[PDB]
């Protein structure tokens, strides 16, 4: 098949032609390797200038895991609104598990180039060397493009911001909290431009989970070692509420764990009566059985609107 050229992908002003890209990428159509490198590195250079902790005003549509499922990413934008007039925040895990990981990366990076101030991308735990080597992304890059393209993606992933402060009310992360993250400044002071370490605050942001019995803890341990992930922690409901109160926040919005309906709202804060934690998951998943359903979160006009799709 035809490999798209730079003139076919970019207009004379340097704007990516994302409708052309969308139609070609869903057929697993490839770009010229130099053009893919241009998309990845231009997007990376934009991400690199962003803060560890993004400042994102409402209105915004918040999205969880994609995992290379390009057809569901296309549906998500239909449900959530066109990026041409909709602000977006993605919470990571763009690659692995699904079949179209490099296509999702190239399309989202193109959208970031086109809408640098209204479409935002965070890092998930899969956006790293260790996991893309263990799953399929590293092999797919080498096959369809080259190791140079894989290396460029790894460097670009290093540039992904770690978190977002949304409407000065919500902390948004892929995974969750850390025993070493007690204030928002704790996130701001991190060096994110690296492979995520095996332990520590950057690891925990990307990897941690609420306890299985979140909201009905038998003990008082805020963070316990995470036996599902084999790294990082489970965080408790008192752990979350204490973080929220200390930092004058309403809730934590995160992704990272698939849910039956595409979302879950956990136990409400005893102070505000608002769910202390919300998980959003924005593409299908294969855990026990296949589950096509997914959801996005649209925060607008002081209404938290959870929109399910893919029924």
């Amino acid at each position: 098949s035809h490999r798209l050229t730079a003139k076919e992908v970019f207009d004379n002003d340097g704007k990516p032609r994302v409708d052309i890209l969308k139609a070609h990428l869903m057929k697993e159509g490839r770009l010229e390797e130099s053009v893919a490198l241009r998309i990845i590195t231009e997007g990376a250079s934009i991400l690199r200038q962003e803060k560890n902790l993004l400042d994102i005003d409402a209105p915004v549509t918040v999205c969880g895991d994609i995992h290379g499922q390009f057809f569901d990413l296309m549906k998500l934008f239909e449900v959530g609104g066109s990026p041409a007039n909709t602000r977006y925040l993605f919470l990571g895990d763009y690659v692995d598990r699904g079949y179209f990981s490099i296509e999702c990366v190239l399309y989202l990076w193109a959208l970031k180039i086109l809408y640098p101030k209204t479409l935002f991308l965070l890092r998930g735990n899969h956006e790293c060397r260790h996991l893309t080597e263990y799953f399929t992304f590293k092999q797919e890059c080498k096959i369809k493009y080259s190791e140079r393209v894989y290396d460029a993606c790894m460097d670009a992933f290093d540039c992904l911001p770690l978190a977002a402060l949304m409407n000065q009310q919500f902390l948004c992360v892929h995974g969750g909290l850390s025993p070493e993250i007690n204030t928002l400044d704790d996130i701001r002071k991190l060096d994110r431009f690296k492979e995520p370490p095996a332990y520590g605050p950057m690891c925990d942001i990307l990897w941690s989970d609420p306890l299985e019995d979140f909201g009905n803890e038998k003990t008082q341990e805020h963070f316990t070692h995470n036996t599902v992930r084999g790294c990082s922690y489970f965080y408790s409901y008192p752990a979350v509420c204490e973080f929220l109160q200390h930092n004058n926040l309403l809730s934590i919005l995160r992704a990272h764990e698939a849910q039956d309906a595409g979302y879950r709202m956990y136990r409400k804060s005893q102070t505000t009566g608002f769910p202390s934690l919300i998980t959003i998951f924005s593409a299908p998943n294969y855990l026990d059985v296949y589950n096509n359903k997914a959801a996005v979160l649209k925060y607008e006009n002081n209404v938290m609107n959870i929109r399910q799709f893919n029924c």
């Binding site: 925060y299 209404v303 609107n305 959870i306 929109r307 399910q308």
Partner: peptide
């Protein structure tokens, strides 16, 4: 405090 609206399909 915002309200929550769930839209299911």
């Amino acid at each position: 405090t915002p309200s929550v609206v769930i839209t299911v399909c």
